[PDB]
Each structure stands twice: as C-alpha cells, then as structure tokens.
Design a protein around this ligand. Structure first.
Ligand SMILES: [Cl-]
Lengths: 251, 259, 263, 245, 260, 253, 260, 239
C-alpha cells in the first residue's frame, strides 16, 4: 500500500472511510501498527503517563517527543506520523514553528497542539511555512450550550487558519456530530462518540496494559485476541466498520 | 574567464545565452564543473537525498549546507555559488538573514529559498541588507508533507503571482520546478530576471539538475525531467561539458523531459 | 512482596528458585512485570534494536539508557533494576565508574557490562566503590563487528575453556550476577556448577540459575522466523499480563528454555 | 549476497579471492559501489583533499569522518564499512578508543589508523574492547616495515593497508602475515587493493597519480567503471607494473 | 481526600469554607502538611529568608524555586501546589511564560507573581496558554527597595482595588492580599469573585497564608504582628499544622491583634 | 561561645564531653541548633530522603550538597560545619579533592565520605592538602544496593584504624553492635560519633527530621515528644547526649 | 541607625539634610564608610579607571559591577547601595531590566544609568517592575567618545536647556534620585530648584541636595578641579571620610574653588 | 628605577637589603605602592577577607585572583608581581601548572602557594616549566625540612607565616633564598603585610602605619622604610 498522506486523510473523509489513529512511541510497535494498517501514528505527550510514569503530561519536553518521533520514523511506516508540541513549546508563533521544525527534522510529517481559537495566528504561521497542523480541542490534557458553541467556534477558527486534521477529546456525542458536520476537514475522536471522521486511543490503553478501572473512553482490544497484532487489527476493523466507539464509550 | 556575477546572469538573459546550473557539494566537482564552464553551482538541500541517504530533505541543517558550501568555495570556482536556506531556517526575516549570513561567511554568493508571494517581506529584508536572493517556486520539496504545480488555470495564475511578487521584492534569479512548459514560458516572458527550470521545459533563461542524476548515478527508472549525460561520454568532465552545451544550444530539455 | 535485592538473588540460587529476568524500558511495563512477579528488570541496550529500530546496539548512548532507567524506576517496582553500560562507556575503570554512577543516580540498582577476563580490574574498581555488577559473557552483542555477526560462543574446547576462565575472573573480582549468552547447554551447565554466583541464561539452556529474554521477543512483537532461543509467551494467552506470568512460571518450573531453545 | 564481515575478509585471503576496497563518502556512491560488489568501503581522510579541497589531510576532523560515515551507513551497504581515525585523534590508547567509539556509533564497523610498531598497545587496547582494527603502514626500511606489520598483527589488527611499498617487499609482508593485506602503490602481491574513488573515476586534472588507473575512461556508466575495478582487482590485472612504487 | 484543584478553591469560597495555605519547600513537610489537610502549599520566595538566610528575597532564582518545587511535588500531596515566579523572571509576558513553564514541568500546578494592574497583559497571556495564575497585591516583598503596610490612604486603597479587579479580569483564579488594613481587604474580597488569601490582611478574606517557619515558631525575639506561633505547647509539629488549618477554618486566626 | 573547631572536638573526647551532632540543611535550623549548642551540623546526603523525597540517597548530587551547605553557612553558626561527599563523587583521590574543594568554597569546614580501609589513600591525599576528613564506617547508606560477626567486627576495627592512620580527625559509626562500637572508640584516639552504635561513642548523630518526629527507626528517638517547642526538643537532644542517657538500650544493637 | 532607604533620601531633601554619597567597591571600605555615616555607597563604573587601570570606563562589564556590588553588600552596610548599569547594558528596556535584576540579586538596592530624555521609557519600565532608578545627566562618562573627552556640560544656553529638559523627563518617568556631573553651578542650582527629587552633584557646585566623589580621589590617591583630598592632614582614613560627610552636610564642600 | 626581578630579590638578600612586600589588588594602589618603592606586590587570597568580606579565604577562586592580578598588572608597576594559587587549585602538579599559567597570562610574574615538603614535586614541575615559585610555610624541625625541600625543588622566594622569631632566624640562616616574614620576627630577608591592615582599615602581627602620617603615600613609605631599617617588625609583632 502507498504512504498515507495529509491529502489522503481528506479523501478518506470524502469517501466515508473512517481513519484509525493510535499513539505509538517506538520502532517495534510502529512496524506492528503498520502491518495492521493503522492510518496515523501519534507520538503523543501521553508518553508522559504511559512511558515515563508521571502523573501528568506537563513534564514531557520537546526533546522527549523528538526522541520517540525518531524511533517511530526509523521504522519507515506507511502511516502518517503526527507528533505533539508539548505544553510550553508553542507560546508564540515563532516558538511554535521552531518546535515543529525540530520534530519534522526528526521524522514527524504533521504536528499537533492543543487549544482553541486563540491559536488561529499560530496555525496560519505554521501552515504558511509548510508545517501541516492537527488541531486539538475539547478536554486538552495540558490544561453546556455555551460550551458547545465555543467548541464549534474553536474548531471553525483552527480549520479556517489552515489545520488539516482535528482531534476532538471528551465531547458529548451529539456535540461531536455537529462539529464534524460543520467542518470540511477530518475529525478524530477520543471520548467524542462515533460521529467523527476517525478515532484515536492511547496504545497501552487499548492493549489493556493498565491495572483496575479502565477509562470510560477506552476498549481493551487485547482481551481474548490470539496476538498483539490481532488486537490492533481488531481496533482498526472496529473503527472502520463503525462499531467502535460503542454507546458505552461516550462522554 | 571572469567570475560569473549576478549582473552577468542578467546580461546573459538579455543576450539570449542560456544559463547552465548544476548542484555541487564538494571541491573536486566544483573544479570539474568550472572546467566545463557551468555558470552557477548550487549547494542544494537535495544533498539530504543524494549524499545523506535520507528519504526527504527535511533533516538537512544549516550547518550541513555551510559545510558543503565551504567545500565548494575552497575550489574557488569562477561560477556563481548559490546555497539553499534549508526548511525551518527562514521563518522570520531576521532568522532568514542570520541563516544567509552564515552561508555567505562560508562562501555562498547568493542564497536560495522556497516559497511564494508570502516571502516578499523576507526577500526585501535580505536584499536591502546586501544578500542576493534566488527565489524558488513551483514544486518546493521542503513542502512535501504539506503537498507538478500549476496544472490548473488558478494554479498557473498563482505561480505567476508568486514569481512577480518575489521579483518585485528584489530576487535576482528564480528557479521554476515541475511546471507545465507553457506556464513556465509565460513566467519567463513576464519576468525581467532570469528563470532557471527543472522539469519546467526549455522556455526558461537556463536550467538546473541534480549532479548525481545527470551523471546517471541512480538505479532503475530515471526521473522524467532528467537526462543521463554520462552514458556514452569518455569522462565525467565530458558529461558535464555535454550538459552545458545542450542547455546552451537549446537541445536540453527535450519534450520528453517536459510536462 | 519485599524488594528483590542482590543478596536475595544469591539466596534464590542456594534454594534452587530460578530467577526470572526480562528487559523493560518504560513505567507501564515496569508495573505490569512487577504484578507478574518478575524478579529482575533489565534496561538493556537491546532497546537500540527494539525501541530505536537500529540494526545493532552500537548507537545506544549512556543518556539513552539513563532515560529508560528513570522511566522504569519511576514505577518503583519491587524487582531489582539492572541497567547496561552501553558500548564505549567502560573503556577504563574510571569511565566505567562515572557511567555506572549516572545510571544509579537515575535509579539503577546494579549495572551490567560485556566482556571477559580483561574486565577483572574494572569489576573490582566498581564493586569496591559500592556499585553492584552483573557480568555478561559469551555472545556479547556490542562485539558484533569483532565476531562478524551474532554467532554462538564456546563451541570448541578452547572457546569453552576461555568462557569458564572469563566467568571465574569476573566472579573473583566481585560480580554478583552473570549473564551467559548463546552458549551450548552443557557448557553453560559447567559454568553454573563451577561459579557460586547466580547465572542468567539467554540461549544458554536450562542449567542456569535463571533466564532473561528481551520483552518484545517474548510478547511476539516481530514477524517471520525468530531466533531459536526465543519463545513467544503471548500466543494462547488472554492478556499481556498472563503472557508475562506464563514466562515467570515456565522459568521457575524449569520448562523454559526447552531443548528446542537450546544449542 | 550476505554482509561482508571482518571474518569474511580472512576467509577470502585463505581462498585466494582478492579483496576490492574503495573510498566512499556518501550514500549514493555507497549504494552504487554495493551494486558493483565492492567488498570494503573506506571513509578515509582522503576526503580532506577530494571533498574539502585542502592541500593535505591534516585539517580533517573526527567530526568530519563521523559525518561522512553516517552518510555511507545510512545506505546500509553489504560492504564492510571502515573509517579512518584522523591524525591527532589516537595519540593515547584512551583517546584512540573514544575516537573509534564515536565512529562506530555513527556506523563504522572497523577503524583504520596510520603508524608502525609503536601502535601495538593502542591496537591491543581497541581490539580487547571489541573495536576491529585496520592498520596502515608504508634494506633497513624494508626490515622496519615488516616489523611494523608483524607488531600490529600480533596486537590484534585484522586488516592492514600497505601504501607505497616496493612490490617484492609487499609480497614478503603478505607471505609473512596471516591477516589480509590491502595495497595502494604496493603492487599486486597483496590480498586486495584500495584506491581513492575520485582518482579511479578520473576526476582529477591532468596526469593520473602513479598508483592509480582511471577505470571510468571508455566505460558506459560510472557503475561499469566500479565494476571494471572490482573485476580487475579480482582477476589480478590491477595493479599493473605501471602502477608500482 | 480528592486532589485540591483550582475549581475546588472557587467552590470553597462560594460555600464559605476558608482556605488554609502555608509555605512549604521540601517533601517531608509536603507530606506532613497534606496529612494536616492544608489546602494549598506555596513554594514561596520567602525561602530566600527562611532557608537561604538572605536578608531579602531578591537573591532567589528561578532554579531555586524549581528545585524546592520538585521536592514538594515528589511527595505527591493532594494540596494544590503553587510556586512563585521570583522577582526579575516575569518582566515581559514571554519571560513570565517561560518561567512558569519551567515551574509547571517541575510540578507546580499554579504560579504566583507580584504586582498590580500593569500585570494584566501578563496574566492574560499565561492563562490563555493554560497556566493558572495566583495574583499578589499589597506589600509585595520583591518591591522592598521601591517601598523602603500598603493601602493606608484613600488613594492607596482605591489603587489596590483597581489592581485586584484588573488581575481577576485578566484571568487570575486566586489572589494574595499582603499587609492591607482589615476593612480594605474585606472590601476587596466582597468586590472580587475569586478567592482572596490574606497575610496581614485580617480575617475577612477567603483564606489565609503564613510562612511555615514563622507559624512553627522557629525564630527568636519579637515576631511580626501578623504571625502566630502555632507550635508552642503542641504535642507535635503535625499538631501545630493541624491547629493552623482548624484556626483558619473556624475563624480563630487571624485575630484583631494580627491585623492592621 | 567560641567557634567549634576540629581540635575542640578532640579536646572534648579527652575531657569526656560527649559531642552532639545533628543534620541540618537550612539557615533557620542552623540558627536554632546553634541556640541549643549543637556542636556539629552535618549537611548530609540524608537530604535525598528527607528533603527531596527520594527512596534512597543515590540521586543526591554534589551541587545539591553545596546548595544546602551554603544555606547553613550563611547563618554563620558556631558549630563545626561538616558536609557529605555524595556517592560517586570520590572514586579517585583527585575527584574526591575536587569535590571537597567545592563544598569548602561553599562553607563546609570538614567533609565526610563513606567507606572502609580502601579509602586510606583518598583520606591521606585530602588531609595532606588541608581538607579535614570525617570517616564513616559500619552501614554506609550509599552501599544500600551492595548490602541489599567476629570477622565483621574485626574488619570494622581494621577500617576505623586505617582511616584514622590516614589522617581522619572524626569518624561516624553507623549500625554497629554496642559492644563492637565500644571497642572501636577505645582503640581509636579520634572522636567517634554513633548512630545506631550505642552510647559508648565520643558523641552522637541523628537526622534532624527523625528526632523532631516528622515521620519510627530503631536507633531514633523523637525528642519533640513531651517538649514545649522545637528549640526545647533540640536542647533535650543535646542534654541527653551529654548526660549519656541517649542513646538508650532500646536504641542500640 | 536604621537602614538608609530610597524614601529616606526624599525626606532628607525636604528636611534640608544634605546627602553624602561616595563610590565604594569592596567590603572593607563599605564598613568604614558606614562607620562614618555615609548615606549612599555607589558601585560605579569609575572602577574601570581607579581599580582596573583602564583609560576609560567603556571596558567595564555588567559582571564587573556585579562582583564589586556583592563585595559591598556582604558588609551589610546601612547606607543605600546604588550600582551602575555600564554602557551597553541598557540599550532596550528589557535589556536594562535584565541588567538591573542581575545587580539587585547581587545586593544593589537602586541602579544608576546615564542619559537624557530618551531614557524616559526605560525608566518607566524599570520603576513599574519595582527597580528603583537613579538618573545621571551632565557629563556622562560612557559618552566620552561622543563628547570628544571629559567636557563640562551645560556651558552654552542650549546645552543647559537640554540638561534641564533631561532632568525633568527622567523625574517624570519615575527616577527617585539624579546625579548631576560637570555642570556650571548656576545651571545645577536651577535643576535642583525645578526638580522635586534629590539631586546629587559632582563638579556641579553646592546647590544640590547632596554630593558624590570617587573614593580614591577624596583619599588623595591620584587633583581634578571638583575634588578635595579629605585625607591630607587627618589622623586616619576613617577621619577623612568623616570630614567629607561633615563638609557635605554643613555646606562647606564643594567650595567655589571646586565649582564651574 | 628598574623593574624588580626574581634575581634582584636574591641580590638584595646577599646585600642585606630588606625586601618590602605588601598585598595589592588594584591599579591605583599598585601605582601608589610603586611610588613608595615597595619591592613586591602580592595579589593574595587575603582579598577574600579584605575585599570580599568573607569570614575566611576558602571562597576565593582562581578567577578572583586572575581579575585582581590583571588590575595590578595594568598599572605596570616596577615591583615584582606575585599572585596566590588559591587552596584547591594546586592539588596535582598539572593542576598547579594550569593555575599558574592562567595567572601569568593575566600578568603575574611569580606564583605563591601554601604547603610543606609534600609540595616538592609540584614546585619542581612549575620551575622546570619556567614558572617562578614563592613557597609559603608556617613543629620547628618539620618547618625547616619543609623550607629546605621547597628550596631544593627550585622555589626562589618563601614566606614564613606565624613562626617563632628564633625559629624563623634559623630557617633564614639555613636557606640561600630570601625569606619573607609575617608574624615571623625581624630575622627574615623581608616582610609582608596585608595592605588594608597596615592602613588601619580594620591583628598581633600588624602595625597600623597610617595613624598619624599626613597621607596614604606617607604611610606606605613609612612601612617600606621601617622594614629596611629593621625597626619593623618589633617584638610586639612576633608569634
Ligand atoms: Cl559536518
């Protein structure tokens, strides 16, 4: 299969093919996810929790993201490689650009950063300078009718500024549905219901690595499968046939 | 011959003498290309692919360009030395200037950087500060993840707008990359500065290729816009000679190298 | 359970309880392995292959090991945390000491480094300064270019004798643990018999005091034909936790490695 | 083919298969030389002349070698990758080791450094620590050359370059040693040969260097030129008498 | 208990539950204060005096605050962790942001910095970028050499209220009032929506703060008027801290004798 | 009172006045401890546990010790200021010397480092270059992972004699049976300072936070219990060391 | 006596008590000057000449001033400690602020920097961020190569007029103290009348709120016209400094022979 | 007058002309001391006390000495310029050499460092490499062994600090190089004091030469004259 490109994600939205995204932080899983036809691999600041064992993502540095990005990129996966700009690394457009350049030099093909309409200038600046941008709105880990209105304004503003992808995190299913309808770019949900152009989960969550209470947004795709590969395939398959997320995984 | 200067390239355009440009990244090829009367040598971020074995040009740093620039410069070629500002090094006019200064200290006589009309302020800033600028429009390889250009009527119109804008801001040379031949003819006719084509057809003031491509150092299918000038020549020198002469007599690029 | 210590490993040898060791490079797997009662977690330079996607372990830096060490240590596992000194970081006793100190500040409780008899002074120097040392003899993967690939070691009487000499030397110098890598089962058996410290085998057969595998190997992460000495414990198991428990159980009941995993 | 290893070179010497070595400093040539079955690629301090345009190799730094080493290694050639420790970077065994480590982290599989008998401790130190070593050397002069070669072999060098040595003196060194010898301006009685890439592609002005043949002249491609070199080394036709010391 | 959050402090104000804040600079005291149910722990530049033995807070660096912040954070207290941006580290909004990010990476959950209405741009900049801000008005100790009690005139009190409204409007979610007449602090508290935290500002604030070593009685001779030694006669250091928390919440501290 | 000096400690041993030592890491407590007439204040790598909240002392750096040293020293206490060389900072005599210099520039008057007979060359090197040295034998907490008798007692006495002969002017005995500590003290001429070593030492040390009850370890007493203030707790410690009532048998092996 | 503060200097002008200032660069002289009740100690870039032996003050760095400031501060004098921002360190307001912060961390309580009305924005920026500012007009020695040497300033009608405009602008921007250097006596008298903040003269005559000299000059270690050697004939260095302080306060120094 | 050199000090000893040494840390005092014909100016770690206000000399760094050395040197005094290697900067012969080089690049003409016969190797190493050395010592039997060892190793000057007078006299008689006393009595080849001490800006070893002179220059001249006529130090200034 060909490499997954940013324009390919748009074409998938138009065709109604749901986008399967997962976080990924190393070369062995990059290769495995690619065998399972994961569309987008995300070097996310979630590594602060799942790899570094910190209570929050705030300690994660730009150099941390660059290191795991280089690891994933060395596998040369066909999937689109997206990397987060961590909290504190995009406070001005020039800082955002320097941060993005570092990660793209390391192998990222698009960068993701959290925030609403205030980011519009930053998004425009990056896109103008050939950095593809994934926006991220809703519950943004680095941080009702009125809340839904502001979410929609945020999402429109970052789309208008040039973002070609957007993550919607912890949003009521009906609100996520409206945002998806109103935008032209693909939306990627986590805890946003099934009316999005695609889905994302943290790798370790969907392999059931945790102990005790599973987060509401997550399904353990490993339990009962014959291999880790089959678990990732089952996730991709369930995203694409519309069965994940189910009603029980909503906000 | 005398050193090739930026005014010399302009005079060549006025006189109908086509400009022969090639990428070059070391002192041995700098000397050989100069022996062959190449007019302009380009230390390009193409070295990310051809020298470093990377899949894209994104990893190439300013320090990388400065190193290869110094190598070429130490040969003291008569050709004009142009160096690329790599992606990420010209995001603001002050950053662009600092980047260009580093390369000019190392021996570049002109800097090249990719982008359309948005660059006008950056071009103006550099030119005002005595940095000669080569613009680069069409397919700009640093934009590979954001992305032949100008196939649409609107696409062609914007390319013309981009070329006019960077010329107006003070660019004294412009590369046209992967443009339909008829669109490139229009751009060339409408500008006053010399145009340098790669995959832009023959209606440009001159031509550029990647050195290694035109020496046939690639396996399998050659890129459409390249000719292997090495095949059938007695020497590497004669291959570069053959490229220079074919650019100048108008025989390269042929219709088969053009979109 | 209480924390696994270096003296606990010695007690386990004396009691015939096999030691279960696995590589580990992050906090999530540190926690999971500890739930499964893995005895020792190794921040190994194997991360160069399995995490970084390099063809050999040679590009792995001291800072790389320190980073993954800190991640594992943050989980505060009961398992003993061992970290490799990567290639080029222990060329003199002083350099080895500075390298070990950095990793122990990051949370390692013992350091491991590759080489035979010539390492005696270095081992002595570290042990004297309270750095616990795990030796590593046989196929030492940082010597890949000296060996001309990943070849089984000790296949001849002279190669077997040197391996014994190496093991004896590093033990006498004060190593409290030793890995035997890619050695014929009968050769590993004799080294285990002759030493007093616990031996930990990888591709060394079952007559060692314990066993180690690379985490990703035993989770079956890789496609195609795997090297003989590895076993995928994920197949047939309902969870990643269950796979790791199965590894621990098989090491301790003596069923892993089997003859099919041994040279 | 499988990867060329240090033990493979030794097996080739015993089989009488001559070893073809060439300098190489970038990924495009790394790939082309591999296609042509070059056995060993050398990131050599010759780059100071042929790439950097310096009059001597003295200005070449460790960082320079590491850069071009990384470029070659990124092509993942089957050929053995050898990199020079430049002058000034192996003055003590500890310094030599740190230098070799930097280059092996960057992708080198063996390091090469110039000098005679006095290097024995340095060679032993590196080899003990799993750094493979290529030595480089070249009536009383002949005796000392043979003493240098024996000393570095004894210390653990697994390959040795003989540069600018009378043919019959090189023949004696090759007979006396067990490890493979690699000649440049040392005649044909060596286990193999090395040239600077640019020299053998005819990229020089005017008169060829004495030890060098232009293998490009008359060939249809640069590939064919490197293929002709490899074939000529292996059938014993290069070097000829005109290429002697 | 659950972690104390910024929204929790707002809910406390609206419920009338007084907020107990105390300075803290290390892991043993972080744990002890948390056992005593201190609501907010402050890594304050007061450490320049009480830990470093300097005559003022001006020598305290951003790295000093980051170090003590990391020590407190490693204890993982439920209390909200607030850290000071020291004088000189927030002179422009970009600088203030860079400083705050360093402290939040080290474990701070909110940053505090001193100044009046001129800080409004700076506060807005940080809050928009997800840095929670505690303001600090009145006697701001980094301003010691500019000043040589703040709000003793009608003009002074008016400016204090303008300062407080400005930083609240800009997005500060907490504010310290230091060395303010009791009736003036009461007016500020009434006019603001966010919780006010007093030191030498009387009892009509949403909460109180003291320097740890002051309330543990660590210092000889006449102590400042607005401090009480909660340790004297206590069975343990823990009990002293518990007593402070209870006194704040039941309205026993500060007394009129601690107030101007 | 006059400043407490290394010779003063030796004179105290010979006079039978027990030496009261406590850890201290900041200026406020430096002043309070001085008001209570603590003889010696130790900027110890124990701060890794008590201040930094780490599970062991291994993460504590030379720069960490230097920072706390400067804090104590700025209070200008009369007590002798001793600072630890942390694990990893004294692996060669030259490294040990460089480390000690940095701490003495910051205000330390003597340095302490852990280990036995092997340290003799290091101690000599430092003492010859005018660095006063406190040795530390028995349970050396930097050896936590290495550690996880007639011969043990014999080696400890050998260790103590060796570091004294090399020039150490003070020695900490940690986690040693009371009768074995008694023998070491009798055999040495320099003052011994016990922690979990019983009462037959020339003096005693505890970690400040332990004796203030801010966490109970066997050899520790909470001196805050039953006292009216933090000052009174420190006073009570100094008095009980000096009248020989601490440590008690319940604090000893 | 209590510490001398910036507000205390303002009070002194209003009471008619002349302010005695002297340069000082080390702890021994800091203590001695304090014994003699010097009001203000200046760590001045004059150290480039008197300590470093340079021909001008241009080579003096911010780090140089910070070193000598720390030396003076360690003596803990009651006098106010003022430190110069050297030429090149206050070219933008943010640069001036960073420079001031470094010196205040080191123990300076007020900073001094040279220039006229163009500094207004810089002064405002510093004062707003709680940095106290002493202005310096007249002969500003860092401008030596602009002026073509150490020339008296204010000789022409236009020179004097600009000096007065400069003094007003910097006071209006928030300077709390101002040095007048090498100005005709009548011109300085007019500046002093027109300002409300204290003026401190050097070669500016007696009609200022106070005086400054370089320490080494007034100790007779060198005479320039506006200097008096207060050592010659006294029994000790202490007595010389005491005589200077007394003469400034009784209005007998500077005399007409020291004035332009 | 001509510049004072290391061999000049030796000539002065042979002639019985007492050597007047004073600490100095800046250009203004360097010039004044020179006017008063001070023979040797010492950039000493005493600056930790008298300039930096520290309780001890331990915080003084090599860079601190190099700074004040440059200041003194820029005055280009005729006096020999000697600079201290601080505690901690001469722990090995290689470290001592690197530290001395830094100071000599900054203008020192000789370096001084404290310690007994253990310094012999270090002294020899520096002297071999053209670094002039002033030793510094301060029990009696070992003191002589210390002084002899550093002289044999090549030191060309030595400071004797806090030494009983009759013991200093014996050390001076046994050595060939000049001895410089502070608290060591008058039977040395010369004397040193800290500048601020002898100007009365504050010790048993010290005389305030300022009180009752008409200028600072006159005070320094009085010091120089009293060292040279043998009236300083008096018995009241002894160990
Ligand atoms: Cl480079």
């Amino acid at each position: 299969r060909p490499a997954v490109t940013v324009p390919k994600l748009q074409a998938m939205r138009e065709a109604g093919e749901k986008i399967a995204m997962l976080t990924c932080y190393d070369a062995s899983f990059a290769a495995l996810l690619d065998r399972a036809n994961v569309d987008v691999q995300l070097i996310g600041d979630s590594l602060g929790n799942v790899l570094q064992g910190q209570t929050t993502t705030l300690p994660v540095t730009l150099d941390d993201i660059a290191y795991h990005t280089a690891c994933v990129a060395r596998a040369q996966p066909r999937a689109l490689i997206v990397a987060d700009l961590p909290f504190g690394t995009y406070g001005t457009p020039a800082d955002a650009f320097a941060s993005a350049v570092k990660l793209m030099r390391a192998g990222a093909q698009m960068v993701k950063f959290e925030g609403g309409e205030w980011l519009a200038e930053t998004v425009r600046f990056l896109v103008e300078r050939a950095v593809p941008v994934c926006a991220h709105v809703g519950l943004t880990p680095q941080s009702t009718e009125a809340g839904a209105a502001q979410l929609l304004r945020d999402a429109r503003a970052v789309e208008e500024a040039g973002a070609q992808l957007i993550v919607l995190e912890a949003v009521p299913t009906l609100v996520a549905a409206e945002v998806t309808r109103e935008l032209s770019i693909p939306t990627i949900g986590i805890g946003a219901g099934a009316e999005c152009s695609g889905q994302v989960l943290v790798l370790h969550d969907m392999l059931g690595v945790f102990p005790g209470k599973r987060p509401r947004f997550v399904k353990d795709f490993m339990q009962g499968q014959p291999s880790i590969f089959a678990a990732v395939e089952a996730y991709v398959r369930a995203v694409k046939d519309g069965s994940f997320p189910g009603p029980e995984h909503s906000f």
